[PDB]
Amino acid sequence: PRAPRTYSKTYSTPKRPYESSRLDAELKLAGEFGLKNKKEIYRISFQLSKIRRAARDLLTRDEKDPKRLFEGNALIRRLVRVGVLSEDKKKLDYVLALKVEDFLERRLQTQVYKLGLAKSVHHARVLITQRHIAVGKQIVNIPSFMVRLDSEKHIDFAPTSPFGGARPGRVARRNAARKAEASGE
Amino acid sequence: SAKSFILRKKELMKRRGRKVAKDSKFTGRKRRHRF
Amino acid sequence: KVHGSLARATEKPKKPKGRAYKRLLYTRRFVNVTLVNGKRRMNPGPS
Amino acid sequence: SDAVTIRTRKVISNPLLARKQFVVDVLHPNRANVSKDELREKLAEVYKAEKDAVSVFGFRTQFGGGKSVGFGLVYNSVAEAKKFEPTYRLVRYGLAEKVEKASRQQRKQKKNRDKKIFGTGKRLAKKVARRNAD
Amino acid sequence: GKGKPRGLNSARKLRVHRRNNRWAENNYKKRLLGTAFKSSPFGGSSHAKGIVLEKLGIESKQPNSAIRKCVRVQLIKNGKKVTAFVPNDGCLNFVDENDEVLLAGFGRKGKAKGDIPGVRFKVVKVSGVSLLALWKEKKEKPRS
RNA sequence: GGAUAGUGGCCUACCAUGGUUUCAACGGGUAACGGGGAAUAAGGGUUCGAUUCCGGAGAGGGAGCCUGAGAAACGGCUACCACAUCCAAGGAAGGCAGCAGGCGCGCAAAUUACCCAAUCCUAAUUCAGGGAGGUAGUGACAAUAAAUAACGAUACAGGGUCUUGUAAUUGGAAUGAGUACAAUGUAAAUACCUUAACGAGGAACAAUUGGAGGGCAAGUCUGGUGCCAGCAGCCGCGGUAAUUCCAGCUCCAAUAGCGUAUAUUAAAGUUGUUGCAGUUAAAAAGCUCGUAGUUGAACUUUGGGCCCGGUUGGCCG
């Protein structure tokens, strides 16, 4: 009789799964960001639809209604601080015209690629999951991290993770062991 | 008579004006041997 | 055919799987399209 | 690591039990882990503690390593630290001794063995010895 | 107009006109009377398990054959006897007599890929193993 | 009047003849515990709710009662009924719709495990107890996050002096699935978090489930078997109510998931209040009267004047 821990789905499959226009649209997104499966596009198009639906029901409400003013400015603050909107489009009429690629641009593996450090978009993903890139001071290995605007300048290599110094990996260690017993003497 | 049916409706969509793939020797075969 | 009793403790090299498989489709589908006939065919036989 | 550092946050003087709560945070940049008994040592001369009177019980290493956070409480005057502390921590610290008792099933089966006997049974043992032999 | 009452105190007619016309449905009437519990071979069940009695030669035609023939099976709970459907040939050597198969509905049909009239119960498992895995040489069926 | 803790046809004595109903009484069915709520989304709705919370009832079926503030109690008693246990044949003992467990049923559901450390409860009470509860085992019910590789060099094919693909060409880096000192964790353990050491060159540490006349995404593919009173006759071609008979290649979708079956919802405006239809496609009573029901013409302080203090935009700052 403990309280049931609430859960909910974070993705929704499309009603029309087979259309050549959309199948090529989502595959274009998958290649240029390096997405493992189509759930990643499904997940973004789910929460994007939730943001648009919430903001759409605010727009039916009249001006200066404090429910619209409080919830609306909350929704503008959350999207700008993440970075989806710019600072010049802080209105409810612009969040309806958001695009899926705006959210994917704010990911971690997309942002670590835009900051050098990757040399390809697929190398950006596989670097992160090997526990190399640390946001601020804490090591992350989640490619859907959704880097905030303030944590943009703190993305570097961890004090661990041999690309940032500190005792290179086991493959080089066995290599250093082999040339120590062969070429060292 | 599955091969007779599949050809019969296929030139009907020539006259209706829609795309349809041109054929070969798999037209009236079980594409999948079942379970 | 039978599973080994202690197993749980032509050939073509395998396709990549997961994220790297989508990299193969994106290269194959449209970056540097291989066969072009004006309508972008996808599976020919003997040409 | 050159030296591990311990930091105490949210200190609460609690004269109700004559102790102090604090959220102990330790930074171990390289080594492996906390080594709790060294934190029991370092939290002794952090002010004045006479190390049997200090206690730490919850700890969790942060993801990726480096930082570990937990709860630790220090008494004064170890004599009532003997009293207010639970038994399982004193056994964990070795300050008390683990008593040995039977399992749950054998304790309860022993209990219902007595529940069928009225009195001490000292008459019954004399009765059944005469009953069996004669 | 429109042939129905529309004024503001006419909710009794609009409520009970719908109740009677709902009886001319098919899913609604089949649900309320509970004919799944009175007439269907499956007692409202999704699957049913039954004892095979004999195998029939319900064949496509005489010798030049598209072999799709199946068995006569009695369900174990209500005791009703139904006609089954087995997949392609090579699974008839699996299904002997009295094997206690687990069978499910067949349902969807096109104008190809199985057009046999009078059968709606494909056989999913025989002797408690499978028919997909038993056909694709994953496991073996014990003999009774 | 009696009875109850107490009102009251609750029961009793007498006296009245009432009480409900087409605004559906009464009877019948429910594979009906009620509700908070669940799924489904353009709206309204349709379907579901045995099940973590609240309320009701039952402890194999009925009934009766002791004790107590509280029980018509069943881990209390008594009787009857239905099952069923032991034996020395006289007698005695029962009630898992509590927790594990087993038989039977079925499409369909787990360990005869550890502990009161937490949450709370009971007692004469900080201390004892609790299959209440928690921990762990089984567990692809359902939900969250995302491994199965990334980079460079050489030679060709390109776009064309800078940019991509190809190769049984080549090079070193990085990492966790695993094993495991130790430490954290825990009532004690397992597991997660951290980590000394080992741990990748492909038949390694190898991803499946479905699908290709349209839906619809994906073939001017291959081989073999059987038949043709069909052409030709070194070969072959075509048909084949073989509804392709058996295999393979290629391609597409989803992906540690995927398919099937039943039920239900959307699509659906095939339940239509929003929002169907009735000449000829399902459907206007043969015709009129007429109670309930539903619906019912217009009409009665309209207009003008006075000042007052407000919330919005501005010429203004």
CSV table of N, CA and C (backbone and C1' of nucleotides) in Angstrom, one decimal, chain F residues 5 25 54 61 76 78 88-89 92 102 108 114 128 133 142 184 187 195 203 236 250 286 317:
chain,number,residue,atom,x,y,z
F,5,A,P,-29.9,-1.0,25.1
F,5,A,O5',-29.2,0.4,25.0
F,5,A,C5',-29.1,1.3,26.1
F,5,A,C4',-29.0,2.7,25.7
F,5,A,C3',-30.2,3.2,24.9
F,5,A,O3',-31.1,3.8,25.8
F,5,A,C1',-28.3,3.7,23.7
F,25,A,P,-39.6,2.5,-12.5
F,25,A,O5',-40.3,2.3,-11.2
F,25,A,C5',-40.8,3.5,-10.4
F,25,A,C4',-42.0,3.2,-9.7
F,25,A,C3',-42.1,1.8,-9.0
F,25,A,O3',-41.4,1.8,-7.8
F,25,A,C1',-44.1,2.2,-10.2
F,54,C,P,-7.6,5.0,3.3
F,54,C,O5',-9.0,5.6,2.9
F,54,C,C5',-9.4,6.9,3.3
F,54,C,C4',-10.8,7.2,2.8
F,54,C,C3',-11.9,6.2,3.3
F,54,C,O3',-12.3,6.4,4.6
F,54,C,C1',-12.2,6.7,1.0
F,61,G,P,-19.4,-18.5,3.8
F,61,G,O5',-20.7,-19.4,3.6
F,61,G,C5',-21.3,-19.5,2.3
F,61,G,C4',-22.6,-20.2,2.4
F,61,G,C3',-23.6,-19.5,3.3
F,61,G,O3',-24.4,-18.5,2.6
F,61,G,C1',-23.5,-21.8,3.9
F,76,G,P,-8.8,-17.4,17.6
F,76,G,O5',-10.1,-17.9,18.3
F,76,G,C5',-11.4,-17.3,18.0
F,76,G,C4',-12.3,-17.4,19.2
F,76,G,C3',-13.3,-18.6,19.1
F,76,G,O3',-12.8,-19.8,19.5
F,76,G,C1',-14.4,-16.6,19.8
F,78,U,P,-17.7,-25.0,20.8
F,78,U,O5',-19.2,-24.8,20.7
F,78,U,C5',-20.1,-24.9,21.9
F,78,U,C4',-21.5,-24.7,21.6
F,78,U,C3',-22.1,-25.4,20.4
F,78,U,O3',-22.3,-26.8,20.7
F,78,U,C1',-22.8,-23.2,20.3
F,88,A,P,-6.3,-48.2,15.7
F,88,A,O5',-6.6,-48.5,17.3
F,88,A,C5',-7.2,-49.7,17.7
F,88,A,C4',-7.4,-49.7,19.2
F,88,A,C3',-8.5,-48.7,19.7
F,88,A,O3',-9.2,-49.3,20.8
F,88,A,C1',-6.4,-48.3,20.7
F,89,A,P,-10.6,-50.1,20.5
F,89,A,O5',-11.6,-49.0,20.0
F,89,A,C5',-12.7,-48.6,20.7
F,89,A,C4',-13.9,-48.3,19.7
F,89,A,C3',-14.6,-49.6,19.2
F,89,A,O3',-16.0,-49.4,19.0
F,89,A,C1',-13.7,-48.3,17.4
F,92,A,P,-15.6,-36.3,22.8
F,92,A,O5',-14.2,-35.9,22.1
F,92,A,C5',-13.1,-35.6,22.9
F,92,A,C4',-11.9,-35.4,22.0
F,92,A,C3',-11.9,-34.1,21.1
F,92,A,O3',-11.5,-33.0,21.8
F,92,A,C1',-11.2,-36.0,19.8
F,102,G,P,3.9,-24.0,-5.0
F,102,G,O5',2.9,-25.2,-4.8
F,102,G,C5',3.4,-26.5,-4.4
F,102,G,C4',2.3,-27.4,-4.0
F,102,G,C3',1.2,-27.6,-4.9
F,102,G,O3',1.5,-28.6,-5.9
F,102,G,C1',0.3,-27.1,-2.8
F,108,A,P,-2.8,-21.0,-19.1
F,108,A,O5',-2.7,-19.7,-18.3
F,108,A,C5',-1.6,-18.8,-18.5
F,108,A,C4',-1.9,-17.4,-18.0
F,108,A,C3',-2.3,-17.3,-16.6
F,108,A,O3',-1.1,-17.3,-15.7
F,108,A,C1',-3.9,-16.2,-17.8
F,114,C,P,14.5,-17.1,6.5
F,114,C,O5',15.1,-15.7,6.3
F,114,C,C5',16.5,-15.5,6.4
F,114,C,C4',16.9,-14.1,6.4
F,114,C,C3',16.3,-13.3,7.6
F,114,C,O3',17.0,-13.5,8.8
F,114,C,C1',16.0,-12.1,5.6
F,128,A,P,13.7,-4.9,22.8
F,128,A,O5',12.4,-5.8,23.1
F,128,A,C5',12.4,-6.9,24.0
F,128,A,C4',11.0,-7.5,24.2
F,128,A,C3',10.3,-7.9,22.9
F,128,A,O3',10.8,-9.1,22.3
F,128,A,C1',8.8,-6.7,24.2
F,133,G,P,1.2,-4.9,4.4
F,133,G,O5',2.5,-4.1,4.9
F,133,G,C5',2.6,-2.7,4.7
F,133,G,C4',3.9,-2.2,5.4
F,133,G,C3',5.2,-2.4,4.6
F,133,G,O3',5.4,-1.4,3.7
F,133,G,C1',5.5,-3.1,6.8
F,142,A,P,4.8,-4.9,-21.3
F,142,A,O5',4.6,-3.5,-20.6
F,142,A,C5',3.4,-2.8,-20.9
F,142,A,C4',3.3,-1.6,-20.0
F,142,A,C3',4.4,-0.6,-20.1
F,142,A,O3',4.4,0.3,-21.2
F,142,A,C1',3.9,-1.0,-17.8
F,184,U,P,33.4,1.4,4.2
F,184,U,O5',32.3,2.1,3.3
F,184,U,C5',32.3,3.6,3.2
F,184,U,C4',31.5,4.0,2.0
F,184,U,C3',30.0,3.7,2.1
F,184,U,O3',29.3,4.5,3.0
F,184,U,C1',30.8,3.3,-0.1
F,187,A,P,19.7,-0.5,7.2
F,187,A,O5',20.0,-1.7,8.2
F,187,A,C5',20.5,-1.4,9.5
F,187,A,C4',20.7,-2.7,10.3
F,187,A,C3',21.7,-3.7,9.7
F,187,A,O3',23.0,-3.4,10.1
F,187,A,C1',19.7,-4.8,10.3
F,195,U,P,36.1,6.5,-10.9
F,195,U,O5',36.9,5.3,-10.2
F,195,U,C5',38.1,5.6,-9.5
F,195,U,C4',38.7,4.4,-8.8
F,195,U,C3',39.3,3.4,-9.7
F,195,U,O3',40.7,3.7,-10.2
F,195,U,C1',38.0,2.3,-8.1
F,203,A,P,34.4,-12.7,-39.1
F,203,A,O5',33.4,-13.0,-37.9
F,203,A,C5',32.1,-13.5,-38.1
F,203,A,C4',32.1,-15.0,-37.7
F,203,A,C3',32.8,-15.3,-36.4
F,203,A,O3',31.9,-15.2,-35.3
F,203,A,C1',33.6,-16.7,-38.1
F,236,G,P,18.6,-24.8,-71.9
F,236,G,O5',17.0,-25.0,-72.1
F,236,G,C5',16.1,-24.0,-71.7
F,236,G,C4',15.7,-23.1,-72.9
F,236,G,C3',14.4,-22.3,-72.7
F,236,G,O3',14.6,-21.1,-71.9
F,236,G,C1',14.4,-23.4,-74.8
F,250,U,P,21.9,-10.5,-50.0
F,250,U,O5',21.0,-9.4,-50.8
F,250,U,C5',21.5,-8.7,-51.9
F,250,U,C4',20.4,-7.9,-52.6
F,250,U,C3',19.8,-6.8,-51.8
F,250,U,O3',20.6,-5.6,-51.7
F,250,U,C1',18.1,-8.0,-52.9
F,286,G,P,-49.3,2.0,-43.1
F,286,G,O5',-50.5,2.8,-43.8
F,286,G,C5',-50.4,3.2,-45.2
F,286,G,C4',-51.6,3.9,-45.6
F,286,G,C3',-52.1,5.1,-44.8
F,286,G,O3',-51.4,6.3,-45.2
F,286,G,C1',-53.9,3.6,-45.1
F,317,G,P,7.9,66.5,-24.6
F,317,G,O5',8.1,66.2,-23.0
F,317,G,C5',8.7,65.0,-22.6
F,317,G,C4',8.8,65.0,-21.1
F,317,G,C3',10.1,64.5,-20.5
F,317,G,O3',10.4,65.1,-19.3
F,317,G,C1',8.4,63.1,-19.8
